[PDB]
RNA sequence: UUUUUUUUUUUUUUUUUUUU
RNA sequence: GCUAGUAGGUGGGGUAACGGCUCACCUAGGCGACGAUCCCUAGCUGGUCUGAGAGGAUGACCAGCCACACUGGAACUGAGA
RNA sequence: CCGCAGAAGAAGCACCGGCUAACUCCGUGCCAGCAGCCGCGGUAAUACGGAGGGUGCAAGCGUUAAUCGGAAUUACUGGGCGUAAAGCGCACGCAGGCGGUUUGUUAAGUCAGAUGUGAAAUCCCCGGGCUCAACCUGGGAACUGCAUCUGAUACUGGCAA
């Protein structure tokens, strides 16, 4: 019952966190092209196995600090 | 028992060398009440002589409009330089609510359920030419049923 | 024609069919051959054939009645991204009842009538009339 | 407020054989059509394509005696109704209370019949509905009340209608004076000589 | 047929040209009588017509016509203002429905009925 | 495709009604 | 051209419940021409003055919000101010 | 509601061009004057201004402050590029728009359904209670989306080739 977005790893700073931000899949009443605007997917990583370069699946978890909800699940699109 | 009506006229009278000149014109429509409609132009030295010459030309053959029963089953294109034009049938029961600028050309045959007013031009000549020259381009029920059969 | 898949299918049956031919032939495509089929089985064309089976060409017997195009009143209304998806009772009902349109939906390409009766909405390809 | 007269002035422009005064002596011989009813312009009048529908709103407005009020408030719902302009409008003016009682013969003139119905001399199944725009729908009933039922004017109608065409759309009793519409009026046999669709096309001009 | 000359006046006889500048809110207003005049030599020899100025805040100075009969329309008053700048008047861009306050306007003109508001004569 | 034999000539007011 | 506990970690503290909601601290991180600064100008909704109606437009019936009642900011006393 | 007593007690303004609509007999000289698009008056003024009659309509009649009418115009639903206005001498690449078309596969958008929301006065239809118009109303419905799931696969995007 998880909401499973397809996140490009698009920033790394924190020892046990990553930013997997892609487009904001909640739409609104408009012309007829795709919803191509970002949302801030902040994620408590710990294995760090996906690094910089995969696309990762994720799931809804507690904000143990400043709204940082999600955790990692699996590699949707491998390594490039 | 044919039906015989004017639609339009010119004032047509200008300056010259020299004083003034004038003329008398007419644009008229004729029909036969089972379904047949037609149109004709004329001129004379005189008013009714122009109407005469015009109606005499209007009496030529008259296109049997595809009516079944009180009105017609397709928007047949009246193609002209932008008139566009089309008419719209009404559900055989309410009247000829057409443009009084061109209604004549359907009341001479008693077409009782057709509407559309003067679409893209404020001139009765523009639509009355457009219609008769595109009414010849009609298809029978048996022709639309060959076009979608044999 | 690649900027609008599969639009040339409705232009080519207008062109050749005005232009004195009983025939037209072209490469086949993922929606065109179903359109060719429905156009025959309603009877707006006399036949279609498909030829060179392993990489086939697609061929239609146009209906050169009075030397004028049967598909003169036609319009292809759904366009790239700005699609035309309509509900089972929003569908076309044109020419005061005489019809018709050709659509596609959850059972293939078909007429709007046959769509309305199966109770389905769909992709409005063209108003045939 | 429905105009009152000179009542034969209405005939001198609305035209021949009107109901408004049906009955005696005046008919033809003083409504002056074919003689010259408008003497000064009589030599060469004209009409208009709109004007000729206008005189036929006038036909309907004066032959039945109804206000501009009612012409708008019957057309108000005639955009909701399902038939022709002749059903939607002209039929109702033929079968509103002050008109249906004339039609059966409870009065002799189509201007007397309104005065009667506002005077509490008629009912609808018991209802003394002086609100005479109230329209009496089929198989339910309209009667002169007891103490007015054979009262002079009634017999000046019923002995005079006897020689004329009585319609089938409605049925009456002529000796105890009560009735209804036995069907809806029909644009064929409604016997008003009017082109019954002119009065709504007159809005489109 | 040379339209730059032709458009100015050509065959209409109401001729629509009216010049009505200024706005800043609405035209139908109250107007203080500010300071009376009857000065200015013109071609229409305007007689007894005290045409005064109004303290309208509109970006320039403006004036009003006396709008109807009754000779006293004093400088201390405050009447109603409306359009209708007859060809006669230079500078002015309004007239006035002026029988408010004590300025009276129509005196015993039985004919005035619904145009100004007067009662019946002797039937 | 060289085309300066003098430059200028005040406002009016003509104007046979009208729907077709 | 906009950030300041604002952006992220540290970890102290307390919210019925989240968090720079935030202090202190180590470092400088956060936004932007796929509208960041900043101001317009506004009562907004079901409805409806007007309906193929798509547009022009109003927010005011009933209430729903608010927000008051002198300019009121605000604490207390009370389930409820 | 039922007897007396009497049509008794109850109406008028625009105005009258031409717009839906009825016209003349007269005045004052672009006087005074309506001024909405038009039109009227420049000593023969059909409505300026008086008057006679009659007219539209009848608790009504003209008209006014705004703005869309008719009139087609900000146009996913709705468009004109010779015209009003209308492919801007010119395209180095940076982001962006369209990315060649079909197999094996997929259903998030596509579409249909089952179930929820929109208690009550809608819009849109009937049946009625008052004498009844109204009014008082009850009954019958339709609500694109969003929710939670069952499916049907022709597009939209993808996945492997």
Curated annotation (Swiss-Prot), chain A:
Protein keywords: Antibiotic resistance, Ribonucleoprotein, Ribosomal protein, RNA-binding, rRNA-binding
Keyword hit for rRNA-binding: yes
GO biological process: cytoplasmic translation; response to antibiotic; ribosomal small subunit assembly
Any one Gene Ontology molecular-function term assigned to this protein's record: small ribosomal subunit rRNA binding
Claim: Cell membrane is one of the keywords in the record: no
Annotated Gene Ontology cellular component terms: cytoplasm; cytosolic small ribosomal subunit
PROSITE patterns in alphabetical order: RIBOSOMAL_S17
Source organism, top-level taxon: Bacteria
Pfam annotation, one family: Ribosomal_S17
Oligomer and partners: Part of the 30S ribosomal subunit.
Misc note: The strain missing both S17 and L29 grows very slowly and has a rather unstable temperature-sensitive phenotype.
Similarity section: Belongs to the universal ribosomal protein uS17 family.
Biological role: One of the primary rRNA binding proteins, it binds specifically to the 5'-end of 16S ribosomal RNA. Also plays a role in translational accuracy; neamine-resistant ribosomes show reduced neamine-induced misreading in vitro.
Official protein name in the record: Small ribosomal subunit protein uS17
Curated annotation (Swiss-Prot), chain B:
Keywords, comma-separated and alphabetical: Acetylation, Antibiotic resistance, Ribonucleoprotein, Ribosomal protein, RNA-binding, rRNA-binding
Coiled-coil stretches: none
Pfam families: Ribosomal_S5, Ribosomal_S5_C
Gene3D superfamilies tied to this protein: 3.30.160.20, 3.30.230.10
Paired cysteines (S-S): none
The S5 DRBM domain, residue ranges: 2-65
A GO CC term assigned to this protein in UniProt: cytoplasm
GO biological process, one term: translation
Zinc-finger is among the record's keywords: no
GO molecular function terms listed in the Swiss-Prot or TrEMBL record: rRNA binding; structural constituent of ribosome
Entry superkingdom: Bacteria
Membrane-spanning ranges: none
Keyword Acetylation: yes
InterPro entries documented for this protein: Ribosomal_Su5_D2-typ_SF, Ribosomal_uS5, Ribosomal_uS5_bac-type, Ribosomal_uS5_C, Ribosomal_uS5_N, Ribosomal_uS5_N_CS, Ribsml_uS5_D2-typ_fold_subgr
Family the entry assigns: Belongs to the universal ribosomal protein uS5 family.
Described function: With uS4 and uS12 plays an important role in translational accuracy. Many suppressors of streptomycin-dependent mutants of protein uS12 are found in this protein, some but not all of which decrease translational accuracy (ram, ribosomal ambiguity mutations).
HAMAP family to which the protein is assigned, alphabetical: Ribosomal_uS5_B (MF_01307_B)
Note: Altered uS5 proteins have been identified in a number of mutants. Some mutations in uS5 have been shown to increase translational error frequencies.
Domain notes: The N-terminal domain interacts with the head of the 30S subunit; the C-terminal domain interacts with the body and contacts protein uS4. The interaction surface between uS4 and uS5 is involved in control of translational fidelity.
Designated name of the protein: Small ribosomal subunit protein uS5
Taxonomic source organism: Escherichia coli (strain K12)
Primary gene name: rpsE
From Swiss-Prot, chain C:
Gene3D superfamilies in UniProt: 3.30.1370.30, 3.30.1490.10
Entry annotated with the keyword rRNA-binding: yes
One annotated Gene Ontology cellular component of this protein: ribosome
Origin: domain of life: Bacteria
Gene Ontology biological-process entries: translation
Keywords tagged on the record: Ribonucleoprotein, Ribosomal protein, RNA-binding, rRNA-binding
Keyword check for RNA-binding: yes
GO molecular-function terms, A-Z: rRNA binding; structural constituent of ribosome
Assembly: Part of the 30S ribosomal subunit. Contacts proteins S5 and S12.
Role: One of the primary rRNA binding proteins, it binds directly to 16S rRNA central domain where it helps coordinate assembly of the platform of the 30S subunit.
NCBIfam families xref list: PRK00136.1
Protein name in the entry: Small ribosomal subunit protein uS8
Protein species of origin: Shigella sonnei (strain Ss046)
Gene coding for it: rpsH
From Swiss-Prot, chain E:
3-methylthioaspartic acid, modified sites: 88
Residues found modified as N6-acetyllysine: 107
Pfam family, one: Ribosom_S12_S23
Cellular component aspect of the GO annotation: cytoplasm; cytosol; cytosolic small ribosomal subunit; ribosome
GO molecular function: misfolded RNA binding; rRNA binding; structural constituent of ribosome; tRNA binding
Keyword entries, A-Z: Acetylation, Antibiotic resistance, Methylation, Ribonucleoprotein, Ribosomal protein, RNA-binding, rRNA-binding, tRNA-binding
Single GO biological process annotation from the record: cytoplasmic translation
Extra remark: At least 19 substitutions or deletions in 11 codons can promote streptomycin resistance, dependence or pseudodependence; all but one of the streptomycin resistant mutations (K42R) are associated with hyperaccurate translation and thus reduced translational efficiency. The streptomycin sensitive allele is dominant to resistant alleles.
Quaternary structure and interacting proteins, as annotated: Part of the 30S ribosomal subunit. Contacts proteins S8 and S17. Interacts with ArfA. May interact with IF1 in the 30S initiation complex.
Family label: Belongs to the universal ribosomal protein uS12 family.
HAMAP family documented for this protein: Ribosomal_uS12_B
Role of this protein: With S4 and S5 plays an important role in translational accuracy.
Protein name: Small ribosomal subunit protein uS12
